[PDB]
Design a protein around this ligand. Structure first.
Ligand code: MG
Ligand code: ZN
Ligand code: ZN
Ligand code: ZN
Lengths: 119, 46, 116, 147
């Protein structure tokens, strides 16, 4: 989604349709502000989420002693130095796929041999 | 069923934003496709 | 128905288928017718037939009820079907002075019982 | 140490997983009803939405958590300034304690003495108690978003 606020109010924006020119706007319900929409998408639900998997990957991730290490060669820098964890999306369903974070290039690679990622 | 992505496009027949948010809740929560109500996880057994 | 158927277818065609448608043509018618028926678608548706037909199978699968798989010990016996194919699992039924109840189950004829 | 006010603050996510209008209200000590989070921030001094949202959600990117805050913003839309927020809090007693000057003066005291008594029970610490409430809403939503 990614929504905007009113400059002047800082209050949130409500969508208004410009019936005449068939176009979407964003009105402020505290002042007389109006701005045209960036995207046609107003609301996104998302039931089968993937946002949470690689959360809290601070560059300090290597400083956690609790995290386990592996000798897996990186797809980028080919470094056999990396820390690993499972999908941080705390759901029942969730697969046991592993996320490896490079102790040099910091690139996040997975063990998923069914699908190919970029997060 | 052939086409790569699986999509369903819906439209109604001033003020419509909230109306559609009700329609999507009805859709997910109240629309029964297959099966009998109260009957979940059906296992086959020999 | 027719318308538806027719338408649707127609528508378808447109778608893609165309081519186828164309063729138608041619064719026849027838185818248608057828367608119506179936338906046709597959047949118607292609080329879907495959997938659409294959997709049903995954659904068959998702319809069968988990199989409690369990071992059978060759030194444990049933009271009816007088056969050495029985499973067991122990629990702490009694206080810490007597320990281990051990429940049996004739994995073939279906009788269950305790050992103390 | 000191009297030990055993006032437990509950920050409630109304509506179930699959119910429309999932609002966030909070039960304040000595106040019968659960006030929608927004009004509390407004009564605190954090007046425009987004200034309020900044205290709750720390990542401007995270659309998922932000959509979850839109109902609250709608719930607190009625109250627009600090005063009207305190009156709304003051209306809901107590008992009620009838008189306009009286109820607005109350809400001041409750937020100072009974709301989040650790941190401070002093005066000018709205900023501290607002960011805390926002840290609480962040945690409430973080669990509801299955993270
Ligand atoms: Mg005894
Ligand atoms: Zn404005
Ligand atoms: Zn690397
Ligand atoms: Zn037996």
């Amino acid at each position: 989604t990614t929504f905007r606020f009113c400059r002047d109010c800082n209050n949130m924006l409500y969508p208004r349709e410009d019936k005449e020119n068939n176009r979407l706007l964003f009105e402020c319900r505290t002042c007389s502000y109006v701005e045209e929409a960036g995207s046609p998408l107003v609301y996104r639900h998302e039931l089968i989420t993937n946002i949470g998997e690689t959360a809290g990957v601070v560059q300090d991730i290597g400083s956690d002693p609790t995290l386990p290490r592996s000798d897996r060669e990186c797809p980028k820098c080919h470094s056999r130095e990396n820390v690993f964890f499972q999908s941080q999306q705390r759901r029942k369903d969730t697969s046991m796929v592993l996320f490896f974070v490079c102790l040099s290039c910091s690139h996040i690679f997975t063990s998923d041999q069914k699908n190919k990622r970029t997060q | 069923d052939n086409d790569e992505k699986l999509i369903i496009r819906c439209r109604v027949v001033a003020e419509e934003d909230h109306m559609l948010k009700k329609i999507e809740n009805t859709m997910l929560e109240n629309i029964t496709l297959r099966g009998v109500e109260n009957i979940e996880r059906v296992v086959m057994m020999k | 128905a027719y318308k538806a158927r027719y338408r649707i277818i127609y528508s378808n065609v447109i778608s893609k288928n165309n081519p186828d448608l164309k063729h138608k043509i041619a064719n026849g018618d027838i185818t248608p017718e057828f367608l119506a028926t179936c338906d046709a678608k597959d047949l118607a548706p292609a080329p879907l037939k495959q997938k659409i037909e294959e997709i049903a199978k995954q659904n068959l699968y998702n319809a069968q009820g988990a199989t409690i798989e369990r071992s059978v010990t060759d030194r444990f016996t049933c009271g009816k079907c007088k056969e050495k194919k029985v499973s067991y699992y122990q629990l702490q039924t009694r206080s810490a002075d007597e320990p281990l109840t051990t429940f049996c189950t004739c994995e073939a004829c279906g009788n269950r019982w305790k050992f103390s | 140490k000191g009297s030990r006010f055993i006032s437990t603050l509950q920050v409630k996510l109304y509506g179930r997983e699959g119910s429309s209008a999932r609002t966030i209200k909070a039960t304040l000590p000595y106040i019968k009803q659960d006030i929608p989070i927004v009004i509390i921030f407004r009564a605190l001094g954090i007046i425009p939405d987004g200034e309020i949202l900044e205290h709750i959600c720390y990542d401007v990117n995270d659309w998922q958590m932000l959509e979850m805050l839109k109902p609250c913003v709608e719930d607190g839309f009625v109250i627009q300034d600090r005063e009207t927020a305190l009156d709304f809090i003051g209306r809901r007693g107590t008992a009620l304690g009838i008189k306009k000057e009286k109820r607005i003066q109350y809400a001041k005291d409750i937020l100072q003495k009974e709301f989040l008594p650790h941190i401070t029970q002093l005066e000018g610490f709205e900023s501290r108690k607002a960011f805390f409430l926002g840290y609480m809403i962040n945690r409430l939503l973080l669990c509801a978003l299955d993270r």
